[PDB]
Amino acid sequence: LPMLQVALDNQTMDSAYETTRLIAEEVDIIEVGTILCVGEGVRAVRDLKALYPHKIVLADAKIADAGKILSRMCFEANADWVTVICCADINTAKGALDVAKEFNGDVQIDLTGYWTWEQAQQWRDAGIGQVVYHRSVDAQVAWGEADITAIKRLSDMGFKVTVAGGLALEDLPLFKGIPIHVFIAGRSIRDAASPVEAARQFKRSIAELW
Amino acid sequence: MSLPMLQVALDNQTMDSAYETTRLIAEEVDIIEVGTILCVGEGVRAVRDLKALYPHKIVLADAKIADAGKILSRMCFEANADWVTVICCADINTAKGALDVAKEFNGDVQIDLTGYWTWEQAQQWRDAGIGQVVYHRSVDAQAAGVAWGEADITAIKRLSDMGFKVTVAGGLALEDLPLFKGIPIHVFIAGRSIRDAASPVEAARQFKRSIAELWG
Numbered sequence: 333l334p335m336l337q338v339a340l341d342n343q344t345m346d347s348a349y350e351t352t353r354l355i356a357e358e359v360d361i362i363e364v365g366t367i368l369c370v371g372e373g374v375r376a377v378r379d380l381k382a383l384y385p386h387k388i389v390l391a392d393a394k395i396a397d398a399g400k401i402l403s404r405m406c407f408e409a410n411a412d413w414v415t416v417i418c419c420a421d422i423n424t425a426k427g428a429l430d431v432a433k434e435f436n437g438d439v440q441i442d443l444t445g446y447w448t449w450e451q452a453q454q455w456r457d458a459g460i461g462q463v464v465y466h467r468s469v470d471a472q473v474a475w476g477e478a479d480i481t482a483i484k485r486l487s488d489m490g491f492k493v494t495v496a497g498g499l500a501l502e503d504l505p506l507f508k509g510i511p512i513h514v515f516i517a518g519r520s521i522r523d524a525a526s527p528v529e530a531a532r533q534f535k536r537s538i539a540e541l542w
Numbered sequence: 543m544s545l546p547m548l549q550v551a552l553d554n555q556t557m558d559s560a561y562e563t564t565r566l567i568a569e570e571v572d573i574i575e576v577g578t579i580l581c582v583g584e585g586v587r588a589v590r591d592l593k594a595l596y597p598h599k600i601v602l603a604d605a606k607i608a609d610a611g612k613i614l615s616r617m618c619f620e621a622n623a624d625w626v627t628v629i630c631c632a633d634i635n636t637a638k639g640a641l642d643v644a645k646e647f648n649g650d651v652q653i654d655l656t657g658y659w660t661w662e663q664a665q666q667w668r669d670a671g672i673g674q675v676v677y678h679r680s681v682d683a684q685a686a687g688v689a690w691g692e693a694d695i696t697a698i699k700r701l702s703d704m705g706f707k708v709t710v711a712g713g714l715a716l717e718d719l720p721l722f723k724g725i726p727i728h729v730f731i732a733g734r735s736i737r738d739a740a741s742p743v744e745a746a747r748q749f750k751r752s753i754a755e756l757w758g
């Protein structure tokens with residue numbers, strides 16, 4: 333089944349823990365959001381993995397350059413996965429992937445903002461097996477067909493695809509039949525009246541649909 | 543015409559490592575950059591602490607903001623940043639969002655040109671009111687053997703012609719400066735070529751002397 337990832341887009345650890353203390357056991361992947369990477373630094377990764385060592389911890393660092401150095405900082409802090417931003421020089425992505433393999437982790441290319449299909453082919457040739465597809469800034473409404481198409485295309489290229497960007501529970505059926513690797517929910521879990529029910533509804537719907 | 547300024551990149555994983563540098567060269571350079579490595583290593587406290595130490599200097603947070611432009615720029619400015627970076631592939635409204643916050647704090651935004659981007663995007667930045675870009679040779683590219691070429695000079699001049707103040711960066715060495723002579727470079731960034739020098743003070747002073755000669 334598609335896994336469920338909670339995005340901790342919080343500025344401080346104590347703010348993140350308001351969420352993890354409710355839903356850490358209700359999700360598969362705990363993301364240190366970019367906000368939290370910048371707010372607290374790599375200690376966020378270390379602390380969250382120590383708390384939840386049975387979960388996959390993703391550092392959403394959106395690495396733009398210095399692939400080897402930044403990825404090593406994250407993996408030394410016990411990250412499982414890290415993100416590299418889509419416009420990074422291809423050697424950045426390769427650098428991050430080489431380090432990831434030393435730690436038995438993985439790299440995802442984060443498809444935030446402008447990227448091209450030629451670049452996608454480069455990442456595939458480079459050995460990248462994961463991408464994160466985002467619904468756009470302004471787009472946030474309704475997951476449109478151009479997204480679905482792009483997602484299927486990335487899937488057909490051999491990427492495990494993550495779906496992200498204001499994801500709501502009701503969006504899930506649009507992706508039926510596509511082997512989505514992960515669905516990310518940040519606000520739709522963190523800011524729900526009941527974060528536990530929000531996470532459980534996501535998991536229930538995924539199980540119905542796949 | 544004005545001399546290019548000199549910016550030290552603090553690409554240190556911890557504050558104490560950064561301080562081993564700033565205690566030597568704070569007064570030898572114009573801009574103190576909190577490198578991406580330091581922002582990720584220590585968080586945005588790196589910005590607050592460095593500005594507290596050096597309140598008279600321009601402090602740049604090299605956050606390379608890709609998304610959530612208002613939130614991430616506000617975090618940096620509330621930590622007393624002067625300038626923040628936004629990575630080139632960011633949605634135009636991301637850049638605009640960072641700039642709106644920047645103007646609230648009487649700061650500014652640079653677009654970081656690391657890795658792939660287009661001339662359509664650049665006009666978008668100008669129309670949006672962005673007045674600074676960082677022409678970056680990727681550090682990973684440089685390790686893979688990418689050198690400063692003709693194409694880099696053509697691109698830089700063209701960005702300059704569009705009305706951007708251009709910063710040059712990426713493995714910059716003292717001997718690279720003459721390649722840029724006759725172009726109104728706004729800033730040169732030196733990370734390793736200052737931090738890792740036998741004498742960081744003398745390294746910085748050499749960059750300053752060469753700049754004064756080449757652009758005087």
Ligand SMILES: C[C@@H](O)[C@H](O)[C@@H](O)COP(=O)(O)O
Pocket residue numbers: 339341365366392496497498499516517518519520609
């Ligand atoms: C923008 C991105 O990195 C966020 O973490 C996103 O993927 C998930 O958060 P939301 O569901 O709140 O949009």
Ligand SMILES: C[C@@H](O)[C@H](O)[C@@H](O)COP(=O)(O)O
Pocket residue numbers: 397398551553577578604681711712713714731732733734735
């Ligand atoms: C990649 C970039 O952000 C670095 O700070 C760079 O601009 C300056 O450091 P170097 O002079 O060590 O390449």
Ligand SMILES: [Mg+2]
Pocket residue numbers: 339363364365366392
């Ligand atoms: Mg994220």
